[PDB]
Amino acid sequence: DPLPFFPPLYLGGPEITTENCEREPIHIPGSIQPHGALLTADGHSGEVLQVSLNAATFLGQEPTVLRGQTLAALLPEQWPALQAALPPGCPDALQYRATLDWPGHLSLTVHRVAELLILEFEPTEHALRNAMFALESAPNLRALAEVATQTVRELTGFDRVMLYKFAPDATGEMIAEARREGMQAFLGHRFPASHTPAQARALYTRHLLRLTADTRAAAVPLDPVLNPQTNAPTPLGGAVLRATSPMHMQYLRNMGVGSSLSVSVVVGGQLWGLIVCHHQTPYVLPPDLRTTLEELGRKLSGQVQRKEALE
Ligand SMILES: *C/C=C1/C(=C/c2[nH]c(/C=C3[NH+]=C(/C=C4\NC(=O)C(C=C)=C4C)C(C)=C\3CCC(=O)O)c(CCC(=O)O)c2C)NC(=O)[C@H]1C
DSSP, X not given: OOOOOOOOGGGTOOOOOTTSGGGOOTTOOSEEOTTSEEEEEETTTOBEEEEETTHHHHHSSOHHHHTTOBHHHHOTTHHHHHHHHOOTTOOTTOOEEEEEEOOOEEEEEEEEETTEEEEEEEEOOOHHHHXXXXXXXXXXXXXXXXXXXXXXXXXXXOSEEEEEEEOTTSOEEEEEEEEOTTSOOXXXXXXXXXXXXXXXXXXXXXXOEEEESOTTOOOEEEESSEETTTTEEOOOTTOTTBOOOHHHHHHHHHTTOSEEEEEEEEETXXXXXXXXXXXXSOOOOOHHHHXXXXXXXXXXXXXHHHHHHHO
């Protein structure tokens, strides 16, 4: 239970230091990672309200031209199924996904937060069964953690995949590791609570996967930065393209990590730990594979719950 959020920087909030890690409002950076584009739209009218400044890279129209258009005009085919898929009241973790054939393929991911639709666009291009069975069949916690890390590494090609388990003081230990020789080994290494601060842990119980595809890439602003509906920040906790905390970006660069991704392990509604993945170079995992990893995280969570109850 951290101290309350600071305002974000663009609303005059303080820049974060090691004295106040937990107060960074990481869910409302007003910016995205440059491997995709993000638009926000009115949930009733479909008016495009905010556009990431790099949108032309992915959509072929400048932000100023996109802004003010409706999703009916921009996405004729998707808008009705979108209108049908995401009416008011739904969980903000609920997703609509589609593939757009853009002259070559864009993955569209849409979620609703209150009266706003958040649209994420990024390039896209029988083994899940075997992964699920492997996790189900592990007869003890050690075996389960080994299978989880090995399976995730196999599926993703990440240089290093670890299982990070939280202690009651919110310090953590890496208790399983699958890696390329000789990525630095963190197996058995322990880390302070502040490295994964309490507002991050809280967010990670609500939105179960997040990533930084390129730890040296500059964030791309949303324009306008505030949602015109509310004159308030746009909630991006459920957007995988959300810019990552600069403090964490620096942590990763200092570790020689070019790309990072984690998946929550949730037991009894608490953050038990994280599947922590690193690559030394930048690395973008395809959207469909992210969905697979989320499924694997849920399965892992349920198996950890099961095996701990048996003890
Ligand atoms: C004062 C602020 C600091 C800071 C804040 C911070 N950290 C995160 C997110 C993560 N931290 C993680 C920690 C580890 N990754 C590893 O490989 C190890 C051990 C070797 C540790 C301990 C992880 C896994 C994450 C999740 C994100 C990811 O998977 O890449 C945040 C939130 C980031 C975000 O979602 O935007 C914040 C604010 N970290 C510090 O050490 C201090 C300086």
